[PDB]
């Protein structure tokens, strides 16, 4: 029941002592299904620091402090495990390898693309897969629609302009225009589809009056002749 | 911790970079073909393995370029204000 | 398949036009399409059915 987020809700409301999640076997163990060993760098670790520092004053009504302090031993162990492992890494480096740049070029580029979830080229009908396309399109629109409207830039080239306290430099909206061309073209997609429907079905529905090798074919020139045969009059 | 790179740094360090990004690409292909969005814990933990390899080559081996290709800009928040002329209904 | 298209007519013509030129160089065999329509055991069976129809009608 989001035990790692209810502590964030109690911290953001500035009242993590008046309730303090009411830690028993019925409440502290129901939202956990021992605390579940949180994942973030410090966004869920600084919460447990303040949660222990607040529950230092009751210190006996909440039995889950032993479960929190056991993971405090595991955090200090795995940091100490890594700090010995980082030291055994930095000695196990061969003094000559000469890491190749054009593979590190392919390693800096492909890592940067795989970070923010885009398709990486290697260089090393069917409505089932139609929903899997439109679920990534609607994924992008709902990600563009959570950015703040007051987004501004800062290039490294403004120091030649000597911007004063109130100067209104002209490079402030070089990220804001690109975020609204992207958000609005992802809504006019079925609009260019209707034009491309009206474009393809207007240039290809004839297909034998402009294309020369098709209007100079035997079967088409005979058929266009055959449909223009006027009826024979009887007597 | 590390648990694999100390054994591998005695030989080449770049082969685990090549073999794991293919696993990152294959798991991402399995993520798009499952209509899921969040990355798995198996490839996120595998992601911090790759960044630790290239960092120590820049740290200790000190690669002859470490190429700088930056956009030389970064998004920042700017202030906002309503107008001071009052509303007319 | 009961109708023909402009795609169907040109594919019928081009496949038939390329196979006759493929016989002069003889890089195709075309022996299965010869002897099955010759069928010389049927041709004598055609003859023997013609031979008995002499005997039956005389």
């Amino acid at each position: 029941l989001q035990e790692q987020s209810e502590l964030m809700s109690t911290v953001m409301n500035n009242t993590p002592t008046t309730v303090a999640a009411l830690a028993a076997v019925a409440a502290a163990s129901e939202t956990n299904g021992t605390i579940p060993k949180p994942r973030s760098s410090a966004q869920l670790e600084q919460l447990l620091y303040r949660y222990r520092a607040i529950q230092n004053h009751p210190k006996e009504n909440k039995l889950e402090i032993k479960a929190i302090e056991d993971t405090f031993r595991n955090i200090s162990r795995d940091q100490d495990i890594y700090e010995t492992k980082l030291d055994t890494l930095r000695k196990s480096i061969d003094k000559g390898f000469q890491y190749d740049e054009d593979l590190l070029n392919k390693h800096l580029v492909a890592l940067q693309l795989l970070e923010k979830d885009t398709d990486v080229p290697d260089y090393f009908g069917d409505p089932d897969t139609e929903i899997r396309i439109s679920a990534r399109i609607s994924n992008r629109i709902n990600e563009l629609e959570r950015l703040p409207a007051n987004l501004g830039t800062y290039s490294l080239d403004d120091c030649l302009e000597f911007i004063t306290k109130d100067d209104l430099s002209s490079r402030m909206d070089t990220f804001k225009i690109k975020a609204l061309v992207e958000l609005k073209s992802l809504k006019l997609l079925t609009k260019q589809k209707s034009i491309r429907q009206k474009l393809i079905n207007n240039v290809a529905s004839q297909a034998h009056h402009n294309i020369p090798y098709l209007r100079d074919s035997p079967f088409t020139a005979a058929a266009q002749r055959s449909v223009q045969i006027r009826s024979k009059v009887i007597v | 911790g590390d648990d694999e790179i100390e054994n591998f740094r005695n030989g080449t360090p770049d082969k685990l970079v090549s073999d794991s990004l293919l696993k990152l690409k294959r798991l991402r292909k399995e993520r798009i073909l499952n209509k899921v969005l969040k990355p798995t814990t198996e490839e996120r933990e595998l992601y911090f393995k790759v960044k630790r390899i290239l960092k120590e080559v820049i740290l200790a081996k000190k690669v002859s370029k470490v190429p700088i290709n930056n956009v030389r800009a970064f998004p920042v928040l700017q202030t906002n204000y309503n107008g001071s002329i009052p509303v007319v209904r | 398949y009961n109708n023909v298209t402009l795609k169907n007519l040109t594919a019928f013509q081009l496949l038939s036009q390329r196979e006759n030129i493929c016989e002069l160089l003889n890089l195709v065999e075309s022996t299965e399409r010869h002897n099955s329509i010759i069928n010389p055991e049927r041709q004598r069976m055609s003859l023997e059915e013609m031979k008995k129809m002499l005997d039956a009608l005389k």
Binding site: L113, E115, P121, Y123 | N69, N70 | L25
Partner: peptide, 26 residues
Amino acid sequence: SLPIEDNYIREVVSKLMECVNDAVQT
């Protein structure tokens, strides 16, 4: 984790003899 330029990502990214031998005879 610094972003890379877009104009750099777009920058990094028997059948003969079967007929000839048939053409020399006939």
